[PDB]
């Protein structure tokens, strides 16, 4: 079985305070609308 | 996107659809009407000789 | 110079009874810590971050996993 996330798996890449700052980064993430495997 | 306290409010994948690439080159979540050169493209080889 | 407390003391009381109890001169491993002072141009060292500025009481509020802050141009 399968489903998807629609927006999931976003974590803080570093210990840096920023306030109202758009910030691009390149790291290991989970893509939007991506299939994950159901389990029981 | 960070708020005024340091919490991630929103996020954008820069590879999903070309509207997100347009957002990812302009560093914003709203885009004004126009045309925007984003990236390149290149036909990939199929086998090796 | 600012570093956290010395907490992970290795058990040197379990095979004998910080190498100060005895190149042997540069084996240290605790890290020293002086006290801070405000409103004067000093050379600060916060946990490996080095600079030269005027340290002042703040108004911002962090999140309890964060160490320092930056800005638009990514300056501390
Ligand atoms: C930001 O911090 C303030 C504390 O003054 C809090 O009241 C507020 O709910 C926080 N979140 C926002 C503005 O999204």
Swiss-Prot record, chain A:
Glycans are attached at residue 35. Attaches the virion to the cell membrane by interacting with host receptor, initiating the infection. The major receptor is host ACE2. When S2/S2' has been cleaved, binding to the receptor triggers direct fusion at the cell membrane. When S2/S2' has not been cleaved, binding to the receptor results in internalization of the virus by endocytosis using host TFRC and GRM2 and leading to fusion of the virion membrane with the host endosomal membrane. Alternatively, may use NRP1/NRP2 and integrin as entry receptors. Binds to host ACE2. RBD also interacts with the N-linked glycan on 'Asn-90' of ACE2. Cleavage of S generates a polybasic C-terminal sequence on S1 that binds to host Neuropilin-1 (NRP1) and Neuropilin-2 (NRP2) receptors. Interacts with host integrin alpha-5/beta-1 (ITGA5:ITGB1) and with ACE2 in complex with integrin alpha-5/beta-1 (ITGA5:ITGB1). May interact via cytoplasmic c-terminus with M protein. May interact (via N-terminus) with host bilirubin and biliverdin, thereby preventing antibody binding to the SARS-CoV-2 spike NTD via an allosteric mechanism. This is Spike protein S1. It comes from Severe acute respiratory syndrome coronavirus 2. The gene is S. The chain holds residues 27 to 66 of 1273 of the full protein.
UniProtKB/Swiss-Prot annotation, chain B:
Disulfide bonds join 14-24. Residues 3-24 are annotated as: Putative superantigen. Glycans are attached at residues 5, 46, 48. It comes from the Viruses. Attaches the virion to the cell membrane by interacting with host receptor, initiating the infection. The major receptor is host ACE2. When S2/S2' has been cleaved, binding to the receptor triggers direct fusion at the cell membrane. When S2/S2' has not been cleaved, binding to the receptor results in internalization of the virus by endocytosis using host TFRC and GRM2 and leading to fusion of the virion membrane with the host endosomal membrane. Alternatively, may use NRP1/NRP2 and integrin as entry receptors. Binds to host ACE2. RBD also interacts with the N-linked glycan on 'Asn-90' of ACE2. Cleavage of S generates a polybasic C-terminal sequence on S1 that binds to host Neuropilin-1 (NRP1) and Neuropilin-2 (NRP2) receptors. Interacts with host integrin alpha-5/beta-1 (ITGA5:ITGB1) and with ACE2 in complex with integrin alpha-5/beta-1 (ITGA5:ITGB1). May interact via cytoplasmic c-terminus with M protein. May interact (via N-terminus) with host bilirubin and biliverdin, thereby preventing antibody binding to the SARS-CoV-2 spike NTD via an allosteric mechanism. This is Spike protein S1. The gene is S.
